[PDB]
Structure formats: structure tokens, C-alpha cells
Ligand binder design. Sequence first.
Ligand SMILES: Nc1ncnc2c1ncn2[C@@H]1O[C@H](COP(=O)(O)OP(=O)(O)O)[C@@H](O)[C@H]1O
Ligand SMILES: Nc1ncnc2c1ncn2[C@@H]1O[C@H](COP(=O)(O)OP(=O)(O)O)[C@@H](O)[C@H]1O
Ligand SMILES: [Mg+2]
Ligand SMILES: [Mg+2]
Lengths: 61, 371, 58
Amino acid sequence: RRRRPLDSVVLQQGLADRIVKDIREFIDNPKWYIDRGIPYRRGYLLYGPPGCGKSSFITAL
Amino acid sequence: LAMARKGAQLGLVAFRRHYMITLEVPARDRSYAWLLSWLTRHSTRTQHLSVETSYLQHESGRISTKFEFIPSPGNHFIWYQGKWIRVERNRDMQMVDLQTGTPWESVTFTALGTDRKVFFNILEEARALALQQEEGKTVMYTAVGSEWRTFGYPRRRRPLDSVVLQQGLADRIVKDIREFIDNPKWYIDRGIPYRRGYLLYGPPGCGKSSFITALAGELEHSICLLSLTDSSLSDDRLNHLLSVAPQQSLVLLEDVDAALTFSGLLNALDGVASTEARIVFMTTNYIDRLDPALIRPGRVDLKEYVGYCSHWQLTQMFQRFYPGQAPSLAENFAEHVLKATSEISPAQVQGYFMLYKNDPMGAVHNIESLR
Amino acid sequence: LTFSGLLNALDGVASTEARIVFMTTNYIDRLDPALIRPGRVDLKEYVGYCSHWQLTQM
Ligand SMILES: Nc1ncnc2c1ncn2[C@@H]1O[C@H](COP(=O)(O)OP(=O)(O)O)[C@@H](O)[C@H]1O
Ligand SMILES: Nc1ncnc2c1ncn2[C@@H]1O[C@H](COP(=O)(O)OP(=O)(O)O)[C@@H](O)[C@H]1O
Ligand SMILES: [Mg+2]
Ligand SMILES: [Mg+2]
């Protein structure tokens, strides 16, 4: 599929930047997990009314 | 001393000449056919030519052979907008192991002029030849279970002028679908699914399925035949088939009235997890069975009615079946048809002219037989 | 095979172009008159026994 830009899914201000900073911190810091014996996994939960963009945003993210 | 200098001077003189001399060398990049065919056509006065034989042995005992002539090994001089051009074609001692064991071939064009605008015109002429010669064919696809397979040979494009509908009905659909293909950027930037819905409804035998066959040929697109009366078709089967459709194709549905549930059809029509560049067409002989919520924007972007033959369709079909006649002769027919018949479907007009093949005056004088 | 189900079989919309079909029947007294109209049969022709012209040529 052609990459849907992240600016197309338009959510509230500050909501996209906090998730980008947290997940970019996870990809750019792989040493913080394994060194401490923690399973190298990250959990995320998005909840809200139907059709708000939970599955839409993940397509562009 | 003198001997060494002479070799150096010639090469050095060439470098200054090289700036004032153009060089082009293609090596068996499947451009030879276009350029070489143009060379013989453009010159019209040539000596050294080679023969290439085509052996189209169709499986019927019929062997069709035609000769395409191209220049042979050697040198040629040609006349163009600029001064005389030196053309040379030379063979080498190396061999190709890919296809057939042939000498590697390089063709060189040498010109006096210092501008590179000249070859730009020559190469462009070659493109015109290749696309004019070949003619596009519409490939039909049929769903074999969960996959698509080719169905017969590539059909010859039925022209769009053959299906004769009301005035402005053929032009309105062409403008809408031509606008869709040339604007792929307007969708993704705005987060809209890059899909288009179409619905054609009307009495049976009006041309709903006929028109869609001819539309793909004009747009140089293929068709994906899919009937909604199959027994091995389910809800999940349709979601897959619309996701593995070939690019530059149109999906056709025949007689949707004879259909699968309505709730499971939502993800099939507008599915987020589906491929891009997908055009779906729907044909139903009875619009009195569809849900009003099925034809909203998002699932169907254009509602269009296809009715019986009007005065516009009768005058044109008479000119199709009897070409080269005066426009006034295509009025005596349409005059008595509407005066002698109250209702007439297009399927009956296509069959009535089969009784008077190559008999124009005979179609006008025997309209009473349609009662 | 039935007679009503033979309609879509003879002239199928989902079929190739440039198709020539030949039909041979030894008994014409079982077919419908509407089956041999133009569109399905474009030329009706009877083939009988040997005439005087056929005996001289054979
Ligand atoms: N925040 C948003 N910004 C832009 N478009 C959105 C947004 N949320 C949803 N959409 C649109 O809604 C449609 C489907 O959304 P969907 O992902 O099914 O919602 P959810 O997954 O939250 O149930 C898509 O076509 C998408 O473009
Ligand atoms: N508007 C039209 N103009 C020219 N020919 C038509 C038209 N409508 C139908 N036909 C002819 O009718 C035949 C079958 O039509 P079809 O596509 O089966 O109708 P529908 O799909 O609406 O039931 C074709 O041979 C076609 O040439
Ligand atoms: Mg959801
Ligand atoms: Mg139909």
C-alpha cells in the first residue's frame, strides 16, 4: 500500500506527538530493556468511540 | 618523435571535434525495432537492407508471414533538418549467451551540429510508431474460487460509440471516470479511500452490462467479470477477490437483483483493508430491491438511470446500420417508428435491423411488423 | 440437458469474439420455430438425397 501520511489522521493537539516520542524512544533505545532482563516489548492501548481513528492512525503510524 | 606525435595529435583533435560531434549507441535494448523501422520509412532511398522473417504459425494450419525490412550491416548517410548525418552499424567478436548466440550490436549516429535538440525529435518519432502499430486489447478476468484467472483471449475493444444511450449520458460518465484516474493524489492526502462506486439501473436489456464492456476499452483498462449468482461465493470470499484484483481493472457485477447478506456486504464495498486503485461497477435490472442506505456517498458516488430507446437512439442506430447516407434519410425511419410503436426496448431494435441487412429503404417501409 | 437451459449455452454473453458455430440435426421435427431465427441461425438449408445433377458429377 501507498503510505498514508501521518498528517491525514487529524486528532487533538499533543496526542500524536506524545505517542511518537514514546515509540521513537522505544525503537531508538533497544539497550535499556535487554540489559535489565526485561522482555523487549511495549504495550499500547487506544480507546474511544467507534470510528474516531484508532485503526486509521495505526495505518499511518 | 614525429611518429609518436602524430598518433597523439589525431586523438587530441578528436576531443575538440567530440564537443562538436554527437554520439548515440544503443545495445539491444528492444529500441532497435522502433528506430530501424523509422530509418527505412524516413529515407525511402536505401541500398543495404536485411530481411527479418516472422513465422506466425497459428494453430490452424494457417501460416502468416510478413517482412519487416531494416538496414543491413554497413554505413549510411541520411538527410535531416540539419546537415548530413553519418550512421554506422558494426558487429563485434563477442557473443550474447542470453537469447540466441549473436554478435553484440552497436549502432552509432554521428552528426555535425552542436545542438542535442535534433535527436530528441527523432527518438520521439519512434515512440509514435510503436504505439500506433499495436492495438490494445481488453483482458477479461473470472473468479475461479478465491483467485482470478484469465477467461479466453483478450477481447477486441468494443468502441464506446456502439452502445447508444441518451444524449449526455455517455459524456457524463466519461468525464467522471477520466477525472478519477488522473487524480490519485487528491485522495490519499485527504485520507479518503481511493475507490469509486458506480450503479446502473433500468429495465432488462437496456445496455447496463453492454456499456461497461466498452468503457474499459476506451480508458485502456481491463475488466474483472464477477456474477452475483454463483453458488461457491460467500461473504469472506468476496473480500479476498476484491483485494487481489489486477491493477488498472474494473470489477463488474451482473444482475445484482438475483443475489450473500446485506450486513456482510459493508466491508466488501468499502473495506479499509483492501488494495488501492479499485473501480467497481454494479448492474441491476430492478432498482426496487436496493436499500436507500446502500446508495449514499462512500458506497455509490453516482446514480444513473438507463431507460428505453428515445428518438436520439433510433436516429443514430439507423446511421450505424446504414452509413454514408444523407442525414434526412435517418429521419423517415425515426418518424414512423415512434408513430407506429408505443414502447420499444433497445434489444428489439438490434434484432429488427437483422431482418433488413443492407436494405435501408426496407427498414423504413416495414416498421408495422414490430407490433 | 433441457431445451430451456440451452438458450444461454448457444449464445453466451461471456464468450469470445470471432466464433463460428456449426449445427447438424437429422430430424427437424423436434425443434422450436423460434430457435432458427437470425441471431442463432443465419442460413437455413436442406440437404436431400441424390438428384440428377449429383449422379452425373459423382
Ligand atoms: N482522526 C481522524 N482523522 C481523519 N480521518 C479519520 C479519523 N478517524 C477516522 N477517520 C476516517 O474514518 C474511516 C474509518 O475509521 P476506523 O479506523 O474504522 O475507526 P476506528 O478504527 O477508530 O473504529 C477512515 O476512512 C478514516 O479516514
Ligand atoms: N443502449 C444500447 N445501445 C446499443 N446496443 C444495446 C444497448 N442496450 C443493449 N444493447 C444490445 O443488447 C445486447 C445485450 O444487452 P445487455 O447488456 O444484456 O443488457 P442488460 O445488461 O442491461 O440486461 C447486446 O448485444 C447489446 O449490443
Ligand atoms: Mg475499530
Ligand atoms: Mg444485464
